[model samples]
Target: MQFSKMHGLGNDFVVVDGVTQNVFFTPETIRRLANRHCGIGFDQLLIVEAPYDPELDFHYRIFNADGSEVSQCGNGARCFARFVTLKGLTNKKDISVSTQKGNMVLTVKDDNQIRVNMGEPIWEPAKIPFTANKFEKNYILRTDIQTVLCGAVSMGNPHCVVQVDDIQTANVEQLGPLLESHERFPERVNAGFMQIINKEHIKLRVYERGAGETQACGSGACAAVAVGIMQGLLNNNVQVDLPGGSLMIEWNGVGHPLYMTGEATHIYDGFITL
Candidate 1:
């Protein structure tokens, strides 16, 4: 099998061209590939496919390092767009790709940075798949050791954003995993630790569902910003600092499509025999 190793910031991926090759993997194979020391070492596996929907240009699937399939992936989407063009699958810069999350429009800008229309942030608890008596800005998540206040949103994937006093002092290692599988979130969720710097800037770290804490998470960043905006704490445009790097997110309040802009980097290509 032929694959390309890619990353957006430091959230790495192994992109396989399912459109060209027969792609199928057992869960164990994915786990082996995700093994850092002996495998491809990626946070997720992105498989590019021909779109079944004629209205869309392409289709793709995202599988976590754990081999669990997911509906959406912000960072991986950018890499997927670049991969198709780089492979000459499509020449149009602006293209629509379908996922379980919905159709997303990806554009490769002149500077080579990729911009994505990440769709509207979903806040209804039922839509987010969170167990709440009713929707509110903050939900109380009770861990064994502590109680946490967080904002929940779905970028077609569940996320819980917790605001902290400082990014350096946040206990992500302990809280992230606990909150991820909390009974309140039926589908599990990505946990984000955010430290507000100003309306325009914030620092964040994410413990992703099925992927653990990565250097950066594009969807996680968008979730944090949407939560921030809902709480009246952020401007429409904001710069998010993740451990890997930064991403620019813009949302025109509610009822508007959110935009995420960042660089999609190509690391190398490899061939594997299955």
Candidate 2:
């Protein structure tokens, strides 16, 4: 099997080009491939395939390290755009790709940063798959250790954002899995701990469902900023600092789609025999 290793802010992926090569992996196979010690470790596996629709340029898929497939991955989308272009699969700087969630537009900026149209966030309880009467700014969830107030949103995938005084001291290892499988979210969720630095800057850490704590999560950053802005704690444009690196997020409120800008790095390429 041929693969390329890539990362966006240290959230790495094993990218497979399925458009030209015959590629398939079982859940067990994916789990083994994601093993850090025995295989090429990665937070997720990104498979690039031929688009089903003529209007779209490519099809993208995401599989977590634990072998569960997901709907969207904002960081992977940036890497996908870069991969297709670098591999000469597409000549256009701006490309449209279809994911399990929906369509996304990816643009390769002059500075080599990638800008992604993350679509409008979904706040409806049914859409977010959250157990609630309706959408509210925050929901109080009681855990064995602590009671937390969280903001829920669906950016093609579910997320729960919580505010913390200091990210460094946040109980992520203890609270992340608890809230991830909490009864309120039927589909599970990514848990984000956000520490606001100011109106324009914030520090974030994400415990991704099935992937655990990652250095960076593009979708998680977007969700944090959305929740912060909706809660009147942040400005429309914000800079998010993750443990791995940083990302820029922008939103003009409810009716507008969120814009995420970040850099993707290609590390190396290799072939592995299954």
Candidate 3:
């Protein structure tokens, strides 16, 4: 099988053309390929497939290192656009793609920066699939080690965004797993730790649902900025600084879709026989 290694910020992916190549992936296959020492080693795997609907240009699949299939990936979506374009799969600079979650519109700008129109954030608990009687600006989540006050939302998937005073001293490694698997979120959740620098900028770290802590989490960045804005702490346009790099998130307010812009890097291409 032929594949290309890619990344958005530092969040790496192993991308393949499921449309042209005869490829099949089982959970075990994905897990094996995610091994750092032995396999292609990636935070997530992206498989491009032919569009099921004529209105869309393509359909894609996202799998975490643990082999769990997910619906949306902000950074991965940008990489998908870059991958398809670089591989000559499409010529359109702007295209719409469908995922299990929803449809996302991607645009490759003149400068080559990729921007993704992530659908509107879902705030209702049941819609976010979080267990709560009603929606609130913040929810108190009880973990094994401690209780946390967090803002919850779904950017096509579940996320718990926590506000921290300092990203450097945050207890991310200790609290991340607890919040990710907490019973409140039946589908599990991505945990984002955010430290605000000002209304326009913040630093973040994310422990993803199935990928653990990564160099960056695009959706997590969106979720964090959304939470900050909802809490009246951030402005419309915000710069998100992650461990790997930065992303620009823009949102006017609630009832609006958000936009994320960043660079997608093409690492290398190779063929592997499984």
Candidate 4:
């Protein structure tokens, strides 16, 4: 099968053009393709298909390296938009694509930056599917040093958002995995460790579900900023610092959809026969 390797701020993916290639992939095939030392390494395999929704132009299906299907990926969507446009699949600078989670709109900004509408964050547990009700303004989730706030929002996927004092000192390697598997989130979750740098900026470290720690997570950043704004700790426009680089997140207060802007690039392309 032919595939292109791409990344958005370092969260990489194997991009398959399902529009031109009717590739059949089983769990085993997906696993093999994601092997870093033996196959095309990636955080997930992005299958780009024709949109089932006529209103949109394309559909994206995400599969983690573990071969588990997932709801949404903020970084991957930016890569998807860049891939489709570079392959000449879409001409409109602004495009809309559907995911299992919801419809996402993207604009290819100048200088290879892509802005994505990640949609509103759902704080109620029923929507987050956390098996609870009545949202908490903030809850302290103690993993070791009271590192996380129990206030979580689902941005197509479960996330634990916490505001800390310094990004440089946060213990990501020591605590990220533990929070990801915490029983509080029965479905498992992405854990985001954040340092609030005033109202307009923040720094984040994410322990992604199934993928472990990554350079960046698009949905995680959106959820973090959303929770911060809801709690009145951050402004609508915020700069998110990640291990790889940074993302610009904008959310109008009063629960408007969140927007994530970042870069997408093709690292290389190759084929692997499984």
TM-score of each: 0.89, 0.90, 0.90, 0.86
Error of 3 at 163 (Å): 0.5
For model 4, the superposed segments whose C-alpha errors exceed 4 Å read: 130-133, 142-148, 173-178, 271-274
lDDT of 3 by residue, 1-274 (tens): 9999998787789999999996779999999999999998998899999997889999988888888787645658888999999999999988899887778899998999899999799999999889998998989998878888999999988999999999989999989989988899999999999999999999999988876787878889999999999999999999999999999999988778999998888999989989
Report the C-alpha lDDT of model 2 over 45-160, residue by residue, as the tens digit.
99999997999999989888878787534668888988988888898987999888778889899999999998998889899889998789999999999999999998989999
Model with the higher TM-score, candidate 3 or 4: 3
Point out where model 3 deviates above 4 Å: 31-41, 66-68
Per-residue lDDT of candidate 1, residues 1-274 (tens digit): 9999998777788999999898988789899999999997998899998898789988888888788786634668889988998999999989899886678899899999888998999989999999999989999999987999999999979999999999988999999999989889998999999999999999999998876887878889999999999999999899999999889999997789999988888889999888
Assess the local accuracy of residue 46 in candidate 1 as a C-alpha lDDT between 0 and 100: 92
Whole-model lDDT values for every prediction: 0.89, 0.90, 0.90, 0.82
Clash list (residue pairs), candidate 2: none
Report residue 12 deviation for candidate 4 (angstroms): 3.2
State, as a TM-score between 0 and 1, how close model 4 is to the true structure: 0.86
Model 1 alpha-carbon miss at residue 11, Å: 3.1
Candidate 3 CA-lDDT value? 0.90
Model 1 Cα shift for residue 172 (angstroms): 1.4
Worst 10 residues of 3 by lDDT: 68-77
